[PDB]
Amino acid sequence: PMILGYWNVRGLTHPIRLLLEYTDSSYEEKRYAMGDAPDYDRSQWLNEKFKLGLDFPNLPYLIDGSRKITQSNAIMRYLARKHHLCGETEEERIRADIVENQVMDNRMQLIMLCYNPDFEKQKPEFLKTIPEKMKLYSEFLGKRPWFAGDKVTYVDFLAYDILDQYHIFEPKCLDAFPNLKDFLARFEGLKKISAYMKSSRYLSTPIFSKLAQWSNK
Amino acid sequence: PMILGYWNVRGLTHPIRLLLEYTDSSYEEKRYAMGDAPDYDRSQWLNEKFKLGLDFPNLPYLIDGSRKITQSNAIMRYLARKHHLCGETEEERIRADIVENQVMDNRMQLIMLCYNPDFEKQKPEFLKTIPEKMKLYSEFLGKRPWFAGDKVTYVDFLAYDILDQYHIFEPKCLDAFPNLKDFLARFEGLKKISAYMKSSRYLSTPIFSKLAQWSNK
Ligand SMILES: N[C@@H](CCC(=O)N[C@@H](CS[C@H]1c2ccccc2-c2ccccc2[C@@H]1O)C(=O)NCC(=O)O)C(=O)O
Ligand SMILES: N[C@@H](CCC(=O)N[C@@H](CS[C@H]1c2ccccc2-c2ccccc2[C@@H]1O)C(=O)NCC(=O)O)C(=O)O
User: Fold this and answer.
1) Is the dihedral of CA B106, B84, A105, A25 positive or negative?
2) What residues in A contact B69, CB-CB < 8 Å?
3) E strand or H helix at B27, and its extent?
4) H helices then E strands: how many in chain B?
5) What is the rounded distance in angstroms from the CA atom of residue A214 to the CA atom of residue B169?
6) Half-sphere exposure of B154 (CA within 13 A, CB side)
7) Where, per the database record, does this protein carry Phosphoserine (chains A, B)?
8) What's the CA angle centered on B6, arms B2 and B9, to 5 degrees?
9) Was domain A86-190 assigned CATH 3.40.190.10?
10) Which A residues, 50 through 109, put their C-beta within 8 Å of a C-beta on chain B?
11) Domain map (residue ranges) of chain B
12) Can you point out the beta strands (E) in A27-154?
């Protein structure tokens, strides 16, 4: 089968796991464990990082026969193309391209805060900026059932993850935006998704590694 | 014409400015200036940030007729589709996907170092990791004239910019990798590119804002 490698956390891999499941892909995972503080041992991965034939070794990685991929968005795009989950028009492509990138920025902002030793004092300033982020997603989606338009695309997998993550962080953050709450429900309502969420493989939390100040255990 | 919005520095926008020239695009740029310390006034952008009708306001932005794009990578892909500078086979698409994302990683690394108050302390250690970074681009490229294959694609402009920036930071970094030096020369050799580099519109430095510890003026 295909092989997915990543840490034994949700991290930035959720969308891939979700996409593999929604597609009925035959895959096996390799979930690498990181030790606890203070050394945070990474040996399980480091022992093989340069032994898998990857061009730019990293986690996550996807091995599909002869094809070896790294960079989470590249993996998302490989599986999208294989299953026709890319935009079909120029308008759908542009919306997908922007959301892919926007998701990574809002993911980077969360990471920055959750790895900061000054987390508890930084937190208040971060919470103030949430409503603006959610507003932009809300206005972007509008009345469409999905981010790219009329049909589910690989970018709905990205968007679901980051909205979900922010919602775990600040549970009241979507109260003001009904179309976002509805989007989450719709996504989770997808049969393959609904199924997966009750499976032994589902890994919602922790989000971050042991080094983080939040969702780290 | 098209409008490219960004700060009056090279930043992360060199690939876009270079692709606009390579494609003989009809464009004008709005180069916003940031005030000096202590406040580093951003008002020139901030007064119009939410009045341009951008979905997710940011810099750079591209206005092309009725289309308004943000996210540098989304601007690059939009131009590539526009001008047929994408990969044409699955193989080339995967190569492009990986590079695009790899370049961003390598950029974020340089950025993180450059905006660290402790830059001088940190530099020496950073320099030791360059060779390994350069070696992966070297082996990836191999004997190919361009990163995705036989034809120039948008990812070449991305690759050019990050190898150029690493070379400014450490002038000896490419000596061990002739294929990378040859690539820089081949890229710079593209006719429209040569002409641009001698023009009044070229902006190779500074790379960063005044907030940075290197290439900040
Ligand atoms: N742009 C690339 C970035 C690839 C990348 O940086 N990989 C990290 C793992 S991903 C990151 C992360 C991002 C968000 C939330 C959590 C995590 C995380 C969780 C547990 C442990 C390490 C992490 C990390 O903080 C990794 O550990 N790499 C192997 C190595 O360096 O040898 C991508 O999109 O795919
Ligand atoms: N993922 C996105 C990110 C877009 C984004 O972060 N934009 C920054 C400018 S770009 C960044 C930069 C990155 C690399 C090198 C230099 C810079 C830089 C230079 C001058 C002044 C500000 C910067 C920055 O540190 C900005 O100022 N945004 C408008 C605002 O927030 O209101 C992209 O790829 O497009």
Assistant:
1) negative
2) 94, 97-98
3) strand B27-32
4) 8, 4
5) 35
6) 28
7) 66, 204, 209
8) 125
9) no
10) 55-56, 67, 69-74, 77-78, 81, 90, 93-94, 97-98, 100-102, 105
11) 1-85+191-217, 86-190
12) 27-32, 61-64, 67-70
In angstroms, rounded to a whole number, what is the distance separating the alpha carbons of residues B20 and B23?
5
Sign of CA dihedral B196, B198, B201, B204: positive
Q: Tokens for A164?
A: 């979900």
- Take residue B162 and report the two structure tokens written for it: 């990050």
Give me the resolution in angstroms, 1 decimal.
Answer: 1.8
Is residue B210 within 8 A of residue B35, CB to CB? The reply is no
Nearest residue to B111 (alpha-carbon basis) of B39, B15, B215? B215
Provide the β-strand partners of residue B4: B29, B62
Do the Cβ atoms of B56 and A140 come closer than 8 Å?
yes
* C-alpha span between A136 and B55 (Å, rounded): 7
A161 in reach of chain B (CB within 8 A): no
Closest by Cβ to B74, choosing from A72, A74, A94: A94
Which residues are near ligand 1 (CB < 6 Å)?
A: A 7, 9, 11-12, 34, 49, 58-60, 71-72, 111, 208-209; B 101, 105
Name residue B154's amino acid. Answer: Y
- Whether B7 is in the pocket of ligand 2, judged by its Cβ within 6 Å, is yes
First to last CA, chain B: 30
B67-70 β-sheet, strand order = B27-32, B2-7, B61-64, B67-70
**Strand stretches in B43-129, DSSP E:** 61-64, 67-70
Q: Nearest-CA neighbor of B19 among B1, B9, B4?
A: B4
Q: Is A129 on the interface with B (CB under 8 A)?
A: no
**Token code pair at residue B10:** 């090279």
Q: Which CATH architecture has domain A1-85+191-217?
A: 3-Layer(aba) Sandwich (3.40)
For A33, A74, A96, B142, B178, the CA distances from A23, given in Å and listed in that order, are 27, 17, 19, 34, 43
Token duo for residue B98: 């990986």
> What distance in Å separates the CA atoms of residue B11 and residue B54, rounded to the nearest whole number?
21
